[PDB]
Amino acid sequence: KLTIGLIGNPNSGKTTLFNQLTGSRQRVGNWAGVTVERKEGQFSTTDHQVTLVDLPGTYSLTTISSQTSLDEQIACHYILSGDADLLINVVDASNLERNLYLTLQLLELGIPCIVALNMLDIAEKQNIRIEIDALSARLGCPVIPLVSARGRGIEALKLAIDRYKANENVELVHYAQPLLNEADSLAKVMPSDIPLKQRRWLGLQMLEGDIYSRAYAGEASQHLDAALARLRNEMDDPALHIADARYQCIAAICDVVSNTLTAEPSRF
């Protein structure tokens, strides 16, 4: 038996993939404490009986700008609740750079994950070519091309689920040493139920100015002002650096991964 969480952007073809996997074997209700719909369904692999949980559409698990989205909170809450044994991240190939911000957050949290590259046919109309193994090597998790024809992308996805394992601990984003040391101090006073790696993540998001992470912080929210001011002795703007270090990482990956599909040559 298994429980998998389906996660991705609003326009990533996530809902369509859910229906194709589960089919008629579905159940409907709502998330705890709200009227927002919660779909669940089941399908079988060679070994496992999978229980697919459809999460709401989301671009990011965090937010700044004082803008709240209940769909994002519900998504982030389920991820941190550790209910699912595995996650399937639906990624749009025609908007890779934008979609990878969510993908990165799932990998930083240490959640076992399988990326499903969707809308490859639309990417080819944009003159875009995706390097699959180059992407997989940098993310440290398997990347399955979700081929529509004959539902053979679903078969490859089921094959990946039976082989699933802990993600390869690669170097994703390269933050500054003071930010990591300060985020670790916030992790000490955070509640001990949450894993160490996830506590360090939460504390890093608090420094950038996240509002969702403060719900799981506890007494660490009181130490934030002292910790944030302490970082400004070394760095000019901590919040700016975290955004740049994150952008730099994704920009580096997209340079290698996203290539031009076809072009008429002008030289020999």
Residue numbers in the entry: 3 to 270
Article, verbatim:
Structural studies have also illustrated a large conformational change in the G5 loop of the intracellular Ras-type GTPase domain (NFeoB) of the prokaryotic iron transporter FeoB, when comparing crystal structures of apo and nucleotide bound states. The G5 motif is generally comprised of six amino acids with a relatively poor sequence conservation, although the motif invariably forms a loop with electrostatic or hydrophobic interactions with the guanine nucleotide base. We have used the EcNFeoB (Escherichia coli FeoB) protein as a model system because of its clearly resolved conformational change in the G5 loop as revealed by crystal structure analyses. We systematically mutated the residues in the loop to alanine and characterized their biochemical properties in order to determine their individual roles in nucleotide affinity, GTP hydrolysis and GDP release.
Our studies reveal that the intrinsic GDP release rate is highly influenced by the sequence composition of the loop, with the third residue (T151) in particular having an important role in nucleotide affinity. Given their drastic biochemical deviations, we also validated the integrity of the S150A and T151A mutants by determining their crystal structures, which illustrated that the mutations did not have any adverse effects on the overall fold of the protein or on the G5 loop. All other mutants were determined to have slower hydrolysis rates than the wild-type protein, with the T151A mutant being approximately four times slower than the wild-type protein (kcat=0.12 min−1). The most drastic biochemical changes were observed for the T151A mutant protein. Interestingly, the release rate of the T151A mutant was too rapid (>1,000 s−1) to be reliably determined using stopped-flow fluorescence techniques. A threonine residue is also found at this position in many Gα proteins where it coordinates the nucleotide base in an identical way. These stabilizing interactions are abolished in the T151A mutant, resulting in a ~4-fold decreased GDP affinity (Kd=33 μM) and a GDP release rate too rapid to be reliably measured using stopped flow methods (>1000 s−1). Indeed, the stopped-flow fluorescence data indicate that mGDP is spontaneously released even before the competing nucleotide is added to the reaction. The data also indicate a weaker affinity for GMPPNP, which is further supported by the reduced hydrolysis rate. These drastic effects were unexpected given the lack of sequence conservation at this position, although it is notable that the residue at this position is, as far as we know, never found as an alanine or glycine residue.
